[PDB]
Design goal:
The structure is cut from a larger assembly and holds seven copies of chain A (201 residues). Chain A has a single domain, classed as Jelly Rolls, CATH 2.60.120.950. Chain A has 201 residues and is mainly β. Helices cover 4% and strands 37% of the residues of chain A. It is classed as virus like particle. The entry lists the keywords non-expanded bat circovirus with DNA VLP, virus like particle. Non-expanded bat circovirus with DNA VLP. Chains A and 6 copies: Capsid protein.
Chain lengths: 201, 201, 201, 201, 201, 201, 201
Amino acid sequence: RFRARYRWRRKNGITNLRLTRQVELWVPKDAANASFYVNHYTFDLDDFIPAGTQLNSSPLPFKYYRIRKVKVEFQPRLPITSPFRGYGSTVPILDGAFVTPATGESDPIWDPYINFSGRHVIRTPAWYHKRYFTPKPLIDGNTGFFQPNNKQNALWFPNKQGQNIQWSGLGFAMQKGNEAYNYQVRFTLYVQFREFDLFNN
Amino acid sequence: RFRARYRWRRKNGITNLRLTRQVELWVPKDAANASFYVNHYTFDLDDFIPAGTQLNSSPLPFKYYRIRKVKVEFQPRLPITSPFRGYGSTVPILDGAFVTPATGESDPIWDPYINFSGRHVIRTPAWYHKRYFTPKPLIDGNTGFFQPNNKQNALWFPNKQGQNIQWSGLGFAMQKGNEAYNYQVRFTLYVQFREFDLFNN
Amino acid sequence: RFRARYRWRRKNGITNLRLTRQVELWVPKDAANASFYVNHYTFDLDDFIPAGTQLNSSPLPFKYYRIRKVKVEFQPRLPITSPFRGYGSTVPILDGAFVTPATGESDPIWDPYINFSGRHVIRTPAWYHKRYFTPKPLIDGNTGFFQPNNKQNALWFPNKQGQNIQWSGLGFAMQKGNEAYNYQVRFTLYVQFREFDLFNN
Amino acid sequence: RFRARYRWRRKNGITNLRLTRQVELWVPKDAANASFYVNHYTFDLDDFIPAGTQLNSSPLPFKYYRIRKVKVEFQPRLPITSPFRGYGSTVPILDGAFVTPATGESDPIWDPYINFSGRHVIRTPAWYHKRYFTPKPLIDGNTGFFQPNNKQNALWFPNKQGQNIQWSGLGFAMQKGNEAYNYQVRFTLYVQFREFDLFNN
Amino acid sequence: RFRARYRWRRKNGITNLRLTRQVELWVPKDAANASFYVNHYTFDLDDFIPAGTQLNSSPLPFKYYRIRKVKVEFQPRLPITSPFRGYGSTVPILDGAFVTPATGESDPIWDPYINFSGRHVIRTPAWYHKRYFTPKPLIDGNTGFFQPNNKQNALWFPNKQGQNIQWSGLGFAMQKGNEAYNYQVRFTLYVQFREFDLFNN
Amino acid sequence: RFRARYRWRRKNGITNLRLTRQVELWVPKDAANASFYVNHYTFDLDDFIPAGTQLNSSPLPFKYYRIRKVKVEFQPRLPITSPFRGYGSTVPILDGAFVTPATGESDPIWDPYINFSGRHVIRTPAWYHKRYFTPKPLIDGNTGFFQPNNKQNALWFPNKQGQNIQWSGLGFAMQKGNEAYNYQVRFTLYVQFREFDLFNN
Amino acid sequence: RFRARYRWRRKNGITNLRLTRQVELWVPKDAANASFYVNHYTFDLDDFIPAGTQLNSSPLPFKYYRIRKVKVEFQPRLPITSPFRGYGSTVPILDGAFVTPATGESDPIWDPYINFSGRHVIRTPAWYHKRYFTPKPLIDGNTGFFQPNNKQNALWFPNKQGQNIQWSGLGFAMQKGNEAYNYQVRFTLYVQFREFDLFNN
């Protein structure tokens, strides 16, 4: 009754791991104009797992995977005695279509994520902020479909180490003050793997 | 009550894997003398897992391990229509001290494992034979201690990939007929790992 | 029923003491390179107990000991108005094999403990951080075995005062900003002693 | 329920034997100085079992052993009408580190075992005295670890007949009067053996 | 309910130890006069504990103590075939005022402790005799007060190692025959300590 | 249950006696000035018990004592037809510090004990007055401590016959009329003794 | 049943008051040496109560007292933005013997109270810290006895206003940084008084 779920994890090699990577978020300065810094983050499994050997292509010796949850943690670098407090917005964009502008066009003076249904408020000189959600894989670019949050029906993907697809996550907009502040963004993937394959000579 | 064992496997990264390797057992010929072929098998984790990278030293990214069970399977190569049937003995030698003679001295004409408390009968032209037991790690050579079969109290060992200790397993004695017969020995380790560590750049 | 545990503590002299020592953690400066400071801490009983007399070799007059728990407390020296916040990782490394590099090679630019199963986040200009766990004794260097967390089956060790073995504890990685910050690390051993021996003239 | 312990003793050849050896304890004389005679006893299995043959190395044809209990019996040689009564101390020293001095230094004038947690009083011209305890094997000399008294988790050791390790037992201190008195010390091991192996030609 | 007494012993460092020392009682000879040998014993903690170091003044690293019980054991040196049997008296004198005469005046021909309310009969060539009672501390010499036997209300005293006060114990009177007989008096203190303080460099 | 209190009184010789002594209180005359006569009474055991012999120092052959209660009875000498009635105050002063002035300074014109918490009114030509309380022993003069009224925890004191300490009792203030009136003060001690010692030749 | 405790407080004048005094704790500077500032505090009732008149010697008109509890509150003077954080230790020393050195010898570089059974951690630029315990009166200097924590059996002491004894309290050790920081120590006595005496003219 619960011992059949144990046989399913042993017949197919189901393993929940937790991968963690860090990046630096550099927000530039904006002297008395109240602009925003709109960008985004997608999660590729090649950034969380290093390169393997010639025999074993991946350091995690599994064939299939799916990412259950992502925890995106904006960790401040500045103290709470900063001269300017900002208030941005973080949304999970599962559609793969972001409001991030390309280079050449100016940064907006208004918050584009402020009316979204899943926006949280990032306070942006000195405060921690985490989002914890289910990412959606960027399978197709023509239709851009994703499936609802169903753990039993989530699609499995091959662990390919170099051709690994990216999963659509977060879009943020942070206010810009008179100083260029920093953040240390930490991405934590909660991956579920399947069919352990370890080649040997 | 059972959900505390789930938190213990997630806090320390407990993962049961199943590693498999093969070797060829060549038994020589013995024309009308009824000798035995006494040898043994110890299990080193470096033979089951290949070499890793410079960053990740092992393809299995865990720090600690212990081998729960070994299945040693003598798989025949010859058909059951062989002109001579033999009857040997397989024992689990946990002490690390085998009755295997060195080179230079002759092979015995009598079965040395036949009076042991845990001997099984291998039929040795053409029949399958498996042993499934708990190996014991060869920690010390001066005292040669091992602990009783207790899953909760089994010692943990560092996965070192090149300095991995060997675990004391099986000793066998196979009869030798007028033909050199073959076996394909398959070792299956049921390892339990701990504290998943995956270095990343 | 509980009065038999009282006779066992009186027949063998069982005494739980709590020893405390302090050390200074100096993290150097790193101007705009985002390096890490990876080091470790092992716990030797000779650092917590001073030297005794010629008659009584130890100020704690017991013959055997075992360390039940260690509390490692990183206590800040800097205020929370520091210009740079860092985010490192603390792990209990029971295997005795650390990721600490020797002198001559450079400090890493990436967190090596970030994917470990038992990492906690140390915030590293100004915030307190404690780890509380069971240390493991560094008995052998060839096999590096340790036993699981079982209070009833923990090995007893002679209190020797000068030949006391070290117990494998914590490995940490702290970010380095533009200033050399300080920490006051406090180690608290929760030792259990046995067989009180007090020599007298 | 109890028939599974019967199959475990038959699958692995468990046999409890009781070995007995004797030695002579010579305590020298000490004219009006009230010195002590401090010495010790360790238990080696080579002293209790004689030499075997070339085929069977040991007269007890088992491969593994562990000593459950030792009974050390100081049996007097002198009658109770002796002109001087002495009062010493017997302790079980499991740590392997005794207070026995080497040759060249004088014998102490004070009882060194008198404050120990497990001392019993030996009356030392004419009275019987027995200690009955669990010995601890002297596995390592660097760390000197031993395990708690747990019958289910006691380590097994190879019966090697010539390389057999010694087990740490008793340390005693007997008063010395004006006459050299004698004792007949009787050591009784309660050994448990495993995996009966009897080689045959 | 009983777990509050466990927190009280851990908050204040309560530890029951058992200290033991020995002395020689020399009773002189008295040819056909039937005199008595009246003396006494007080218990100082400096006689049971040796000298410490400069850092830790005492080998027992506690600050406060109180002696719960004393066991005074007169252990014979002579056999039971002695030509003269004597019959003395042992009393616990808690008041601190003994009937022991100074040097210069003769020893009495009559038993002074024989009518006391707490006298026991010591048989004095060859027989063992123990007293087990609560000692009383010699706090003041002007009033000589002591408190009743109440374990919960017993006064705590500083462990000072050189200024330690003496506790009022036993007064004895032993008959003297035609031979100078010996005794080995053994004092066993059952001390309770408090507030473990171990200085460290 | 009550038979254990009987064994305690027989093992230690507990005996409640009742000692009685008398003294004359002379209050002087004071013609039309309304002064007071302030004095006090302390209770020494040497005043209630006479001198003993050389062998037995005290007529009450006990070693320890404590005074449970004192009854101080002011018994009049004058009839109720006296020309002046006075109204003083009696207090139990347990602290040992009285308001009694020394010689040389005048007697007060106001009642000093009238506002005390335990004052009773003595009517002072012709009326009887008793106080019945627990005295407190004058142990120390530097701190002047006493213990609360607890019969089970009362301190025991040596019966020394000549060095017996005094116990702090009553302080009174009686009005003075035109005639010098008399009182016969009767002190009744309710002593409890311990450890009957009767020396004999 | 509870109305007898009301009559006891009215017959003897029992009154619980709460006295409060303040002092300034000046900790000196120590440039890069990591020394400690070890000192102590004893509580005298003459510091909490001012001088009285000639008639009434004390402004609190009671004769006896005992201090039930002391609250020692280290109140910071510096803000939490201080450049150096320190971590000391506060212990209740009831024995009257402190580790405070006299003038002439240097201040220690190590914490002497860190291994004590009742140490709390004072954080020492800017944080509040309170201890709340039962003080012990410094009655004798030769034996230094104190009684256990029993409210019903606590000794009463005379309120003398100028000869009032001191009660043994707290010993602290505070780290010293590059600046001389301040504290405002507040002592709150919870005294219980007895036998209200108010002299009147």
